[PDB]
Design a protein around this ligand. Structure first.
Ligand SMILES: [Mg+2]
Ligand SMILES: [Mg+2]
Ligand SMILES: [Mg+2]
Ligand SMILES: [Mg+2]
Lengths: 470, 470, 470, 470
């Protein structure tokens, strides 16, 4: 049962909009909206969206596996060894938010302060003492972006696994000699850094020039979560405010995906006339180029929606019905919708590129979609006795208690996969968890969970006190 | 009763090192060390210090008032109007961590997300609705460092007040016309930005070329907290680890100040031979140029301690007894003391330049000295009934309740001064508070509070859980 | 008769290597090597080449016209109006080295000091007084590279004409309103800058992703000058020194073009066995990325010559027979050939990117190929009486003499085309001419002209004296 | 007889303004204006000046020797060895425009292409073969500004000699060990780069914070050329155009120096009332910060001429009588004087910072003052038989002829000093000479030479032809 199986299972259920049905439904962890900072929904005048992994949630592990297969084929195509073709995507290995260390070829799971929680070289999980040889302070300077790449998006899951596959392959293949910073193949030296760059270039290529979009579109049921409650929620948002789309994707792909998401034999509710997807939006903007979008952005362009091509020149005209924009900036949206930042709830999955930046640069309110949560919550609740035991051990300590703390930490983490929970390793929170807490005002496995809260719900979080205030 | 009066009052008391006396003493809020993240003192092998406002705590309001007077005299000297001489420093106005908005000439108190808590133009406190004219989203992008300057150090307190004095003066002086972005004096236009730059340049000048150091040194009792417990604590640190000084100050000033701090007719304890200040340190480094010190730094130089001048050339030799370094980097210290980052507790008052950067760039453990806490804690405890009432009102709301929330917020904040508490405005935490929580592992009004904890105390903070984990 | 007609006519003649035949041949202007600075050929130990417009001289106007047609089709493909398809390339309009002013949409012919010699808006040639409205000092700051783009390569000839076509078209098409900085089409504004960027992007696209290479290769006789004397000269160079190729082109294209250039039923001389092109080179380097090549460059890679693909990794091995390199730097070449800069004569057509940079960054000796010279020399000699008259008029002046100076200047310049000579407008030298003089030690219409000078000829230029020395 | 002795000798003569007297006078090389590009004086509407070494020509070697002595004393003051005090300035060593190579501690005389003409390590002149060890191609990349500093100003003459003194001293002092890149003094290493930086900092300090200005002003007759013809020429300029001053110096120093330059008991001519220096200028601008002045510049300020201090704020008012500006940009001047670039003849000594930049960035006409020319011309004419012989030898060659070419080159060069002529070494022109030719439209030992040409003289230079045009 993947996280997308959980989401699609919930998507298949029709909305019971009886007020008591809603009240009962959103008590369950799975259908809840989680609150980091209080948010009065009555003050929200605009609802904004990203598309990929927000409105269009790609099914797991099928979509990662397709990305993986195409990336592999691209690398083989440019001259990587044929053995790569015998790799197969393994959803049990990667967790999102790992750091690739390009100097030593390791995947690292870190906390908010750069402290190492997990280190794997290929598929070899390196224990505490052996990590000190390369990381004397069990620490990395994560701002050293030439050396460290943080694999923070769901699109990075296939390359997270591929990097490990490649390091493993080259290490165990007799044709290469393993060196501290890469591999020697006679008079050729392949650094982990150049290998990483090839992978990164190949993923980019697959998305922008290769066949990933085409293969997705030719089998949308296989690859994309579909939920009849999507149109209903968007219609309800539009009754109390404005709705916009701001996506990095191009118009043609956006139109294919969105048409599929709205292709039901009815509109918002069963029995209603079907309406085109575009009618759900007061403003539609593609080719957004976030995160730059939240600063200077790029020039505002107009999409010719017949051809899918941009009209020539900068668009100087007003917001009108049926217009589709390309590029622009976050100010374009504010100014055309007559919104201030705090009037906007921006809904997306990119914890850095969208949520962090819209919050820091513009003061937008934020809703982070975390697809993996839909399954992480089942593990958290089913194995709560492991975490509870770990808590008790840390308490009792505060000798063989440490050994047992390590063992329980391991067993807990393995329930989530080889790289553990997205949010922690044992009692230590990940960088990703800290970023969610700091920059996502609200979060959930799906933004559909908003459907279960009344129009002007007050989402509440407790006031924060400093230690000397407590 | 200033914060420095509280600290000097505590400094006058001799240390009772009976273990039960210590236990009882550190229960009191005033003598406590506060914990943001757990820290096992047994793992600390090196103790590092800044000098200014850490070891050498300048008395308030006397030192701010001297800074202020000299800055004013410098501005008059370069052609500012004579009326500046009638300003007098007022400790009741400034709170540390305010933002000067150089576009509109306002002082702003902000939260961690750039939301406006307080806005004053000169001495006019601007209410919610009027702030929207200049700040439509009640928000500033604090990363816009060309526009916004954050007055985060205790050395910035005089200029915080001076900026307000100047805006007030120019606004109410008939010779000038008030404009949106500055003042017109016939064919001269003085922008708030250029005015700010003059102030900033003048403060710098007073410290580096003017008479501030000289006047401080000619009356150290007036200007500098002195505490016989300082040598005792440093001696105790040195029994379990190494001790170092890394200060931006030059050798001559450092020597004058440190000699005074250690000038008692005894060494660590009464009855012991007096020892020179330098004997308390395994490594002494001046001209550190933090924050750059925590990255590339500058070349390592050696101080000729007779002349106070640098020897010519880069120092390539070992750590030896009696050597004093200048410049270098944080790695110099680690490598010469044989320390990893997490072995080091770095003790300082600069929440950005030292504490934040040593934590993020190097993984050092951090102790933040917050001198104002020594008095903020007395206000917090004495007026706890106001905060408690505010908490109850926010709870009851969660109409005239809002009015009462505003009124109680005002009354609470005024107990701290016109710009309120360093740490909050009513129930909203400041940027400064959020930074302390995030980057200071431990904090206190004085690092002397460490004297009251046993050698290998385990400072404890509760594990953090995400909302979905709770 | 184009310049390439002259070159191909000379290419069809077999080499008469009798010493007196050579002596007589190189007296003629057409077969001469011109000398800016003295160069002792005996000191040259290595001969280096670019490919495009150096070894592979593309026939005119056929190749420009193909570039033009494909660029137009690309612009129409992305949404430019259908009318573009009625443009036809006109070799009489463009001269190389014009500056496009992206602010006002003008093509400018300038001297070395940025003084305006010619200004055309579309096809309207703007006279002295009207140019002052936009250029008050009849001057541009050519270092302002955001505003001014210098069209310095032979590959830029089609876009030089296209830019003028487009400005003309948009100006005279009633659907658009002409503005100072571009064109208004209702709610779309197309700046000359964005229009220029589209053109530049389209040219790039045609070369890198479109069909230009494919169409060239499918008709090499139509598009590429071929000369049996090429192998003979290269063989002679190789008898006295080393020979290398350093080209920005990729291996597959290089191999196609070079195979054609050497496809004769003989080797260096008639009667000799044919040898593969690669055997003429001690070192072959593709994907050079000049001008960066002359500084840091990129990592050295090895080409797999069977597949045309790069081997994976950085190449760490020695120079060996049959190896083909990709990327690297100018130091790679020096170090592998055991050459110092002044031992190298580098032969190319790119007056900036190759000749200027190899001279300034490395001190290489330089030979600039200027294909247009092959016809400019015929005009210069045939219309020498116009220049001579202009000289006499400038002398006589040093009233209606000025009028006559303008008229004769016009008539002279029109012999070369609408944008005049590459090297001057009347008595005023172009920027291009000044750059040739300053950075090309030797120059000619073709490097084949070296065949007519003995092995160790001393190319002589007179010593330069300052005015006070004269 | 120094160059300033020649200039002061010519300054002592009263102007004979009879037209035939002028005609005869300007035939002599010493009183001539030399022409690189033709310049019609009738088109000049504004005459602009720098002060230092243009209007105020500092006497040699006295002023260099004062600079030297103060720089030495500053270095000793910061801890350089006492032996420095035994150095004495030697005008026979330095020539202007040498390059200090900070890696190897050499002074280099180079041509326009970076080819080495002379290399000295301390006072050891390194011969051809030994220079190849450090300079394998007898070439430096002069754009590598971290490594190479070009000593292009007359203010750099003392440090040119001091650098050589220091390298010599450290090399021959047994306390230090000479290394490839500097000197070892036990556990201190002083790189040539750090030594160079100390020197450069000390020169700056002497000018800006030390006693150089004060000592100059207390003996202006000793230090500054004074010429009664200065006011006469400026008065004549003002009859046909506008006159301005744009100097990097501050107002107080400018006023002291200019008052001295105009302190005669008469105005422009004997018998006329004395007029203040400021009355000779339509616009006076100090604190210019050239070269930045020729781009964005700094804000325009107004000098309070009573106090010598800047008024507070940016000056927004018109040009008026008696106003003195500070900062600004070259556009300020153009706009306030109603001039286009080519209307301006800018007169200065800084071949880079003023002449080059005003020409390239703005298209100003340029007059370069080269004080040393006043004596270089006497050497050139007196030893013309050496140059003539060298010319004949280069011709005859074009064996022992080379030996004789080297010997004659040496003997010629030694007539100018140990570092030879500013303009050449034997038949090879220096970088400095090439820059003068390229960027100075006119040049002379003194701008006073303009007094000998009629109001609207046409300065003529021959048209330049390319080799293929000749
Ligand atoms: Mg997305
Ligand atoms: Mg401090
Ligand atoms: Mg080429
Ligand atoms: Mg000067």
């Amino acid at each position: 049962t993947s996280w997308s199986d959980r989401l699609q299972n919930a998507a298949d259920m029709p909305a019971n909009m009886d007020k008591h049905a809603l009240e009962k439904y959103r008590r369950e962890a799975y259908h809840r909206v989680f609150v980091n900072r209080s948010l009065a929904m009555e003050k929200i005048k605009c609802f904004g969206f990203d598309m990929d992994y927000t409105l269009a949630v790609y099914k797991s592990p099928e979509y990662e596996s397709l990305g993986f297969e195409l990336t592999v084929e691209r690398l083989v195509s440019i001259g990587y060894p044929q053995e790569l073709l015998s790799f197969a995507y393994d959803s049990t290995f990667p967790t999102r938010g790992l750091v690739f260390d390009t100097l030593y070829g390791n995947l690292l799971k870190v906390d908010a302060y750069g402290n190492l929680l997990v280190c794997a070289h290929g598929f070899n999980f390196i224990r505490g003492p052996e990590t000190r040889e390369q990381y004397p302070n069990k620490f990395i300077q994560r701002d050293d972006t030439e050396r460290f790449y943080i694999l923070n998006t769901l699109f990075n899951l296939p390359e997270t696994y591929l990097l490990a596959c490649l390091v493993d392959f080259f290490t165990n293949c007799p044709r290469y000699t393993s060196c501290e910073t890469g591999f020697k193949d006679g008079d050729l030296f392949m650094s982990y850094r150049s290998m990483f760059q090839d992978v990164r270039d190949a993923v980019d290529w697959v998305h922008y020039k290769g066949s990933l979009k085409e293969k997705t579109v030719e089998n949308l049921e296989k690859y994309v979560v579909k939920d009849g409650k999507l149109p209903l929620l968007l219609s309800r948002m539009k009754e109390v405010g404005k709705v916009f789309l701001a996506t990095n994707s191009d118009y043609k792909y956006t139109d294919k995906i969105m048409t599929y998401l709205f292709d039901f034999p009815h509109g918002p509710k069963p029995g209603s006339s079907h309406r085109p997807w575009q009618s759900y939006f007061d403003l539609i903007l593609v080719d957004a180029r976030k995160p730059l979008f939240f600063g200077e952005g790029t020039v505002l362009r107009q999409v010719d929606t017949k051809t899918g091509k941009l009209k020539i020149g900068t668009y100087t005209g007003p917001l009108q019905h049926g217009i589709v924009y390309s590029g622009g900036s976050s100010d374009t949206i504010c100014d055309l919708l007559g919104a201030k930042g705090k009037d906007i709830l921006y809904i997306g999955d990119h914890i850095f590129g969208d949520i962090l930046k819209s919050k820091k640069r513009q003061g937008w309110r934020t809703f982070l979609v975390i697809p993996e949560l839909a399954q992480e919550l089942h593990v958290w609740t089913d194995k709560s006795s492991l975490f509870e035991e770990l808590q008790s051990l840390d308490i009792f300590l505060a000798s063989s208690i440490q050994r047992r703390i390590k063992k329980v930490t391991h067993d807990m983490d393995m329930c989530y996969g080889m790289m553990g929970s997205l949010f922690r390793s044992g009692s230590r929170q990940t960088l990703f968890a800290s970023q969610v807490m700091r920059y996502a005002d609200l979060y959930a496995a799906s933004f559909i969970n908003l459907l279960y809260y009344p129009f002007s719900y007050l989402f509440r979080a407790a006031h924060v006190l400093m230690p000397h205030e407590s």
